[PDB]
């Protein structure tokens, strides 16, 4: 991230999360993942503010696509988006996070390990490890929208109320990533029927994420409807 144009000007929580995700990935058996049109940096404006986006994307044998996106709209909204899309053959859950900030601080902090099984449960090893972290206390919880039925019972969706909560959130994401990277070493390839189940779950996850009109409006204000539809369906939440 030392080469990032956006990092130096992003919200401090976002900065720490970007670093933590990058650190988690740094020693993995990474290969490039080429986004559509080999996208890296992109910017656009229409009648209002400009949107700037920096994309990084990788893959490993366990993760089909590892995408970390940083964005800023003018000087007033920052975002971090990250999804680790699993390879269905290994049946791992989906790691995701979305952090939205403005000049008055973080407005939304979301992180999850989301199920891909038909029964909408995380694998047993994840349930146990997540349970062992304890129920975190956050003063300003937010209710997920209906499309957010895709998220697990361990999903965080808050407005951080103070620095202690920002740090607690980051630490919880660090803990999710630690659990996830360990489970990815002990996963073994699944049966064809199980693989198919997990593929289904990942498709559903992407279709539901595409219902997020708050993201879509940010993109549309800078690039227009057609661009935004392509971005959400081909770059952010591609249906496999
Ligand atoms: C260019 C990329 C990008 C942008 C611009 C973006 C913006 C964005 N996401 C938001 C919400 C949100 N974002 C999520 C969740 C997620 N979203 C994800 O991309 C992932 C991976 C998850 C979860 C793992 C949810 C649940 C909300 C709240 C939606 C709502 O309030 O209706 C919001 C509203 C913030 C608020 O209400 O305080 C904005 C502006 N998200 C992005 O990804």
From Swiss-Prot:
The keyword Oxidoreductase applies. Coiled coil: none annotated. One of its GO terms (molecular function) is phycocyanobilin:ferredoxin oxidoreductase activity. InterPro entries: Ferredoxin-dep_bilin_Rdtase, Ferredoxin_bilin_OxRdtase. Pfam families: Fe_bilin_red (PF05996). It catalyses: (2R,3Z)-phycocyanobilin + 4 oxidized [2Fe-2S]-[ferredoxin] = biliverdin IXalpha + 4 reduced [2Fe-2S]-[ferredoxin] + 4 H(+). Its EC number is 1.3.7.5. GO terms for biological process: phytochromobilin biosynthetic process. Catalyzes the four-electron reduction of biliverdin IX-alpha (2-electron reduction at both the A and D rings); the reaction proceeds via an isolatable 2-electron intermediate, 181,182-dihydrobiliverdin. Belongs to the HY2 family. This is Phycocyanobilin:ferredoxin oxidoreductase. It comes from Synechocystis sp. (strain ATCC 27184 / PCC 6803 / Kazusa). The gene is pcyA.
């Amino acid at each position: 991230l030392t080469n990032s144009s956006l990092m130096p000007t992003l919200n401090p929580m976002i900065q720490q999360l970007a670093l933590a995700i990058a650190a988690s990935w740094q020693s993995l058996p990474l290969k490039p993942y080429q986004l559509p049109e080999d996208l890296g940096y992109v910017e656009g404006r229409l009648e209002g503010e400009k949107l700037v986006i920096e994309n990084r994307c990788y893959q490993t044998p366990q993760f089909r696509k590892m995408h970390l996106e940083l964005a800023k709209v003018g000087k007033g909204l920052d975002d971090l988006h990250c999804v680790m899309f699993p390879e269905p053959l290994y049946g791992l859950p989906l790691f995701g996070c979305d952090i939205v900030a403005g000049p008055g601080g973080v407005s939304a902090a979301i992180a999850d390990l989301s199920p891909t099984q038909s029964d909408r449960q995380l694998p047993a090893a994840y349930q146990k490890s997540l349970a062992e972290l304890g129920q975190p206390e956050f003063e300003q919880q937010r209710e997920l929208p209906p499309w957010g039925e895709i998220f697990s019972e361990y999903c965080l969706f808050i407005r951080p109320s103070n620095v202690t909560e920002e740090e607690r959130f980051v630490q919880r994401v660090v803990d999710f990533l630690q659990i996830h990277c360990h489970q990815s070493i002990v996963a073994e390839p699944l049966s064809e029927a199980q693989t198919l189940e997990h593929r289904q779950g990942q498709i559903h996850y992407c279709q539901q994420q595409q219902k997020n009109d708050k993201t879509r409006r940010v993109l549309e204000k800078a690039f227009g409807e057609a661009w935004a539809e392509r971005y959400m369906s081909q770059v952010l939440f591609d249906v496999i």
